[PDB]
Subunit: 253 residues, 6 copies
Amino acid sequence: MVNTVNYFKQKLKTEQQIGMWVGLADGYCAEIAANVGYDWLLIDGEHAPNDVRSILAQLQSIAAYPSQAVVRPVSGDVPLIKQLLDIGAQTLLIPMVESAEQAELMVKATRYPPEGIRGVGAALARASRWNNISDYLQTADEQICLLVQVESKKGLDNLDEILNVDGVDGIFIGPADLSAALGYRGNPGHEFVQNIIVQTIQKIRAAGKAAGILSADEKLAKQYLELGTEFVAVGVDTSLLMKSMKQLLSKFK
Amino acid sequence: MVNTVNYFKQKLKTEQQIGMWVGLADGYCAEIAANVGYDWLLIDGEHAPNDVRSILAQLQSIAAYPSQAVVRPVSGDVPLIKQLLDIGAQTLLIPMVESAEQAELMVKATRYPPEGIRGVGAALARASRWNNISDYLQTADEQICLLVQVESKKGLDNLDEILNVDGVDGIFIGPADLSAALGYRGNPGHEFVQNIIVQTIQKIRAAGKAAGILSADEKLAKQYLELGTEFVAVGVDTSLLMKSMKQLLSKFK
Amino acid sequence: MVNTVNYFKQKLKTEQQIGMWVGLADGYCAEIAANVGYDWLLIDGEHAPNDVRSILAQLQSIAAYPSQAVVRPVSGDVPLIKQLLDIGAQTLLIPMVESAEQAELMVKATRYPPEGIRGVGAALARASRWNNISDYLQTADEQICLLVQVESKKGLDNLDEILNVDGVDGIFIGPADLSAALGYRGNPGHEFVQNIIVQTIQKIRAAGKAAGILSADEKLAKQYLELGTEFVAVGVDTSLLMKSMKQLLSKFK
Amino acid sequence: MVNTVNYFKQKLKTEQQIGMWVGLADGYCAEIAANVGYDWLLIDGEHAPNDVRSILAQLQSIAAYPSQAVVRPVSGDVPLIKQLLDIGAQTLLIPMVESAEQAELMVKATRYPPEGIRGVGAALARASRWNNISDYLQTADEQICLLVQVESKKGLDNLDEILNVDGVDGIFIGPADLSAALGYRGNPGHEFVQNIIVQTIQKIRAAGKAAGILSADEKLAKQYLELGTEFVAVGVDTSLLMKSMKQLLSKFK
Amino acid sequence: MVNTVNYFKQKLKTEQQIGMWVGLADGYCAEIAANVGYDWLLIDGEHAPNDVRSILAQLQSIAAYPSQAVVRPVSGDVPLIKQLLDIGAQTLLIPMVESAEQAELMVKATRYPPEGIRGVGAALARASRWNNISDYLQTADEQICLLVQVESKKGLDNLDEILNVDGVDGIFIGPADLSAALGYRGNPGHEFVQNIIVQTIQKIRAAGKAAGILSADEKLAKQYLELGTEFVAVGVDTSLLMKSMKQLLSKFK
Amino acid sequence: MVNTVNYFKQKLKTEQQIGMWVGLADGYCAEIAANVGYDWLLIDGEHAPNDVRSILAQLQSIAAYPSQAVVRPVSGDVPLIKQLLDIGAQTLLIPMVESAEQAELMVKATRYPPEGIRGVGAALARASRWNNISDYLQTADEQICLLVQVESKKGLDNLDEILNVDGVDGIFIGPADLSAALGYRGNPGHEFVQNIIVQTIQKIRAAGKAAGILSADEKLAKQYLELGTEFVAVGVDTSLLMKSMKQLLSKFK
Ligand SMILES: O=C(O)C(=O)C[C@@H](O)[C@H](O)CO
Ligand SMILES: O=C(O)C(=O)C[C@@H](O)[C@H](O)CO
Ligand SMILES: O=C(O)C(=O)C[C@@H](O)[C@H](O)CO
Ligand SMILES: O=C(O)C(=O)C[C@@H](O)[C@H](O)CO
Ligand SMILES: O=C(O)C(=O)C[C@@H](O)[C@H](O)CO
Ligand SMILES: O=C(O)C(=O)C[C@@H](O)[C@H](O)CO
Ligand SMILES: [Ca+2]
Ligand SMILES: [Ca+2]
Ligand SMILES: [Mg+2]
Ligand SMILES: [Mg+2]
Ligand SMILES: [Mg+2]
Ligand SMILES: [Mg+2]
Ligand SMILES: [Mg+2]
Ligand SMILES: [Mg+2]
């Protein structure tokens, strides 16, 4: 077996990838989402009730389907990153990255020694398919993709520095945390927030990195796609479930 | 503590109850559905991957919310009916009921001896809140609601006899099984099938029982409500989740 | 490895075994019970929300401790008896046994062909410790104990015939179902019910079988032990948990 | 999406398929087995501690890999067959089939009305990918494969009758149950047993059906493959795990 | 929907709330506790085998009942506090708080930017009921209650500074850790320890904060209630289960 | 009940203990390993998909069997160490220990105050059997065994200092991490790496501590036992499972 090819990572340079947020925290729900045809599925370990074991079950469901999995850990925690890479998550989205120093540590967290600090346990790992991928320890680093989130004033204050970190493949902008950080909590639609988001996307792409964002607003999502944003999540499974059930009931109240 | 009042059962005589099918088989998904405001939620133990323990978790989720839980067991299995009643399901929907003799057996399966054959285990049961409902063994039978499904030619061949069974509170028509039985598998919309459904609903109500049905077709659902159908399920969580994700992707393909 | 010795089964002829009902349906709760020192623990697959997998977890917990495990399946279902024996339950309590014919079928359900109808799958079974018990298929039958419950008028009507079945090790009287069947639901303490229980215990022991019963009433339990009842369950984990929390709150209201 | 093609079923006529028994009852263990390259993996619901939900998790793991899944239910139970088909098991191995009448009922259990009695619930089913396979109710029956086990004297007494049942794709011989039924429990290697197995395979193939068997004995397995046996399981995951760990310890005792 | 009202938080100023420790780490056991009528239930993520997912199941169970849930995380970990708030825990008890600086960080951990550092993920959260609480991000902070534990010499050394932190609603004294820190491990009943607890309670209340404590000793508990302690836990589910089973067995030995 | 004796700890001074790595992360798989007769079983919480709850289930499985459980947490996290000690892990293997200061912190993390910083929660803990071990808080520290891993250049740069820490019972060498740190990722067999391992084992034993290692290479394992290495793991469950299935398939390809 050759290592699983990270098509999400390759496509960061060749196309615009449409994503779905997966917060239903369940292998069965993850499989339903995997049938739809999204370019990527974000398995949310930060804001959905997930742990390593529930994330593994969702990787296993999704693996049969072309959709690429991206995992967001609860924080940029080196041991947790180690665990998520070993269960076979090839793309990580680190929340609340705020400095070049923190971004560099997240790069190292994803790479084996001697260049990185990723713990070695290939005999045990779904990532190597329990050494059925025979050259895994040589080929692993190449198919790993590191995305970091800028979603605080401190992150924006360190954007040029983060964008100069070799090994950051992409910067994702989270309008919820960012709008709240800017004192517009629950109102990311405000011009003050939007102008900052647009400038941030332009700077990301100007530094040769992939830009990403989430918007459930179709107009904002198509606007970000017209700017060239490489990875755009266009909704959230929990929101689509709740909204579809509410809209149906409303026809009968 | 007094026994939980089965408002679903009472409302069979006073209003038309709008329902949602719950096949996501998960306490977290069940809770999302419970927030919407459906009169009833059908926890599907026949066609979703549920067992006693996953149905219990969904009853516990839904219990904080006004929505009434109805449970469909995989078949009219007396021991399984005993297990679902003890975890505290107060309304059961029995699939594939085909005779008065079978319907009478389902009635007994729901009632304590000496009048029925429901096994006694009140010390252990969520149904009695572990005897915190102190008169449970005297008050239980009154808050249990039995629904049966007619979805075969044999059931339609025994409809008058089923409708004469004291203890059957409602007959639910399953258009999927029924249209397939009638040789229109996948096409319940056909006039031959629809005329049989309308006459069946009329005969059910004429005999003083509640009629029920599921249609995800808004027009058919509103037609069934115009006939006075007492319990109408108008959608399915798995279907709404898949369709909402597909419709969203299609805006970006 | 030699087959696990069924000490419960041996002690049916040598002492009076004190039991605890385990209906908390959980490996962790089962282990707490296992620490107390009861002779036997009844893992209730009939009136607690258990399945094969949760019963296995409770056998594994209890296995480190001297307490003997007894499993009650939901019904005398031959395939379910097969499953419980293969996960390693060496004593079964079959509810609602009503004839010599049913009791004989329960005997056969617990023995390998050619004498019985127990499905053969020793390579896969915790019962054989995956063939680490090398002579398991020769030695299994000796360490299996079959108990049946008489808890209906029909069972009482067939008691002499059930007591003549070679292979029934014990008859357990369930006062909840029996009092309900007799038209005293929730009031097993009535003299009419108690005279029938005493006569039943006497007949069981006169036929050389072990008699068993459950009572949470200390006085009734010690009365049953004075009669020579061989296996007496003296409480239920759910009841003791609920009662001890209620009694505590009452000191503070 | 077109229905998943049942390559196991097609290959019953074109090659000899090598199988592995999966009794570790776990999605993670099932994935390890799925990486090896077996033609088929038997997910054992009869002799391993599996339920519908654990079998679903193993189908999801295996689905990413070319190995074909076969599910053995605990018995030929029509509602359980319905559940296993809806979670997407395309090949079933029914234990302890003993008559043409029982084999015919198992055929019907796998086919939609009006020709069969498989319950219709395609909106809810992984089998239809929640109707993402748009013609599922028309295309399903074609990719379903029914295997039955002959493993009792009564089965052998009805072999010609079972082999004349249209819709039985294959007969699997279980040497453990059969050797025990013949009074050679734990010794299927005996000439009396082997001659019966060989004659049985010859009769199966002469009637145009696929023959199958399990042997962990390499010589017996290659002997059955030389006879033309179409589906041969050559070991058991629980046995290989236990034997590999025992052999390793023995080098160090 | 309006945000769930935190009645525990309100009652800190109006009454003395009686609590039960919940360490059985199970949704089913949590529901049994929920039925008793305690003012509050402490779901112990520090000393019982709980994770985010098992705490969620226990919140869902308890939510149907009047008892208020309080969650103790394993440590004052900001990302873990984020996760517990998003699953809907409205009151947190932070163990081993030792400085005003740590207490201030715990305050911030519970409030959205720009005033705090709580991660924003309202679309995904049971806390917002997946945005069915439409003004959640404006109304969340008011219904969150922060309790901190003082249970080390260093905490006692910083008590006045911790009591001056705006946003700490209550200080809970843990006599187990505190007696151990003081060199009386396992003997909190000693006068040296009790004088320090009484002085600590007095200082807490003098600073306008709520005081809390746990004692399974009825006399110590009523002494703490006579001092005006606002939240008093009076027992532990594991202890009551083990003690009630031991006391029962002792009547029969 | 007296505290469970840690025979693994005692045997560090009296014999050479043969170990098996347990990364199948499942109570059922752990039990299979427990039957084999290894001196110790390493429940891997670093490189297998385990959490506190799945490690507890494996401790409960293994507890019926002579094999001693050792738990590797994901990192030297003080709160996580507290959780694993309370579920009753008596021997811990800390990964990536790099200084005497870190080793001393791990010592304290394992000991109750006032000498250590282990949180006190004996009423709740399987470790105390919920206080059924009545003197647990006085007897606990004696049966806890602390192992640390040296697997970085920084650890080797601090080896003498780590070996001078009272409370470190053993130092385990992880050839995977170590060979990678040394710039021979995937090639621990290299003479440069092996000479460093031999000198390290010699220095560990010279300082009166137990030396440990894992090699799946029989020759290297027997070489390490010839040097007097006190605890030697000789295989990994996931590896043995995958290799045994692959070797079997290869006989039939
Ligand atoms: O896309 C963002 O802004 C995120 O980082 C996370 C997501 O959970 C939102 O907060 C939805 O509420
Ligand atoms: O409503 C009906 O027709 C049912 O009885 C069951 C439901 O599963 C549908 O068949 C969805 O496909
Ligand atoms: O002992 C009996 O009577 C039983 O067979 C079952 C037990 O669950 C009781 O019904 C408690 O309510
Ligand atoms: O192959 C057979 O004989 C079976 O039908 C099942 C299998 O479990 C064996 O009994 C192994 O013990
Ligand atoms: O109340 C306290 O002292 C605690 O903080 C925790 C509780 O677990 C006890 O330690 C019980 O042993
Ligand atoms: O023994 C070692 O080298 C370890 O520390 C961990 C183990 O996971 C191996 O790396 C297997 O790949
Ligand atoms: Ca289950
Ligand atoms: Ca977990
Ligand atoms: Mg964010
Ligand atoms: Mg139907
Ligand atoms: Mg009974
Ligand atoms: Mg068989
Ligand atoms: Mg404490
Ligand atoms: Mg290592």
